[PDB]
């Protein structure tokens, strides 16, 4: 994979959808805003001032926290706190569920 250094700027939690921004000579990361398309997924807790890395790779699927109950095949978007939630507005869809998840459980997703 291709790794690079990035700094959290707002208490990154594991399995949350992440977004990024241009910071002080470094890419800064945080939980993705509600109703959008995320760029990266957390797989480690990284606090507000903590420095970490990002492992680049065209992953087939992500495992993220379900922000609500999810049915197999549901199109997903970002929700509160960077969780993944069911939707129906194409422009905010970043992937879809291949398995059932209850709120708070991990849900595997396939990118689109």
Binding site for another protein (CB under 8 A): 1, 3, 5-6, 8, 12, 14-15, 18, 20, 26, 29, 39-46, 50-60, 63, 106, 110
Distance CA 103, CA 62 (A): 16
SS3 sequence, 57-91? Answer: CCCCEEEEEECCCECCCCEEEECHHHCEEECCCHH
For residues 19 and 8, the answer to whether their CB atoms sit within 8 Å is no
In angstroms, give the least distance from the CB of 36 to another protein: 16
**Contact of residue 42 among its own copies, another protein, none (CB under 5-8 Å per partner type):** another protein
| Residue whose CB is less far from another protein, 5 or 80 | 5
Q: Using the 8-state DSSP alphabet, how is residue 23 labeled?
A: -
For residues 5 and 53, the answer to whether their CB atoms sit within 8 Å is yes
Residues in contact with its own copies by the rule CB under 8 A: 2, 4-6, 20-23, 25-28, 39, 54, 56-61, 71-74, 96, 98-100, 108, 110, 112
SS3 state of residue 92: helix
In angstroms, give the least distance from the CB of 16 to another protein: 10
**Contact of residue 34 among its own copies, another protein, none (CB under 5-8 Å per partner type):** none
């Amino acid at each position: 994979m291709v790794s690079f250094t990035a700094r959290a700027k707002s208490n990154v939690m594991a399995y949350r959808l992440l977004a990024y921004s241009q910071g002080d000579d470094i890419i800064e990361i945080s939980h993705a805003a509600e109703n959008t398309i995320p760029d990266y997924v957390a797989v480690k807790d990284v606090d507000k001032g903590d420095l970490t890395q990002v492992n680049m790779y065209p992953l087939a699927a992500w495992q993220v926290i379900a922000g609500s109950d999810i049915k197999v095949g549901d199109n997903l978007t970002t929700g509160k706190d960077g969780t993944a939630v069911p939707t129906d507005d194409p422009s905010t869809v970043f992937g879809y569920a291949v398995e059932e998840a209850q709120e708070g459980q991990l849900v595997t997703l396939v990118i689109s």
